[PDB]
């Protein structure tokens, strides 16, 4: 099983104690997720519907322009 291209963002529903706000739709994640599901790759707080709507853009950043 070679092929594994998980370049994608680790989304994990966290446990803090209250949603946090979506940067993919800029709106607090309501209960309809436990809490906010944060990347655990490069730390990206996001919707239970809204990582279907990002093109995977983790690990993917990009080097400064020096
Ligand atoms: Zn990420
Ligand atoms: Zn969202």
Same mark, same amino acid.
Request: charged share 25%; net charge positive; with cysteine.
């Given at each position: 099983?070679?092929? $594994? %291209?998980? @370049? !994608? =963002? !680790?989304?994990?529903?966290? *446990?803090?104690? &209250? %949603?946090?706000?979506? $940067? =993919?739709?800029? *709106?607090?994640?309501?209960?309809? #997720? =436990?809490?906010?599901? !944060?990347? *655990?790759?490069?730390?990206? @707080? #996001? =919707?239970?519907?809204? #990582? /279907? *709507? #990002? %093109? &995977?853009?983790?690990?993917? $950043?990009?080097?400064? /322009?020096?």
């Amino acid at each position: 099983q070679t092929d $594994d %291209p998980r @370049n !994608k =963002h !680790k989304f994990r529903l966290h *446990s803090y104690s &209250s %949603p946090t706000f979506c $940067d =993919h739709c800029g *709106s607090l994640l309501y209960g309809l #997720v =436990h809490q906010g599901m !944060k990347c *655990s790759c490069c730390e990206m @707080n #996001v =919707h239970r519907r809204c #990582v /279907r *709507s #990002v %093109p &995977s853009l983790c690990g993917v $950043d990009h080097t400064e /322009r020096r």
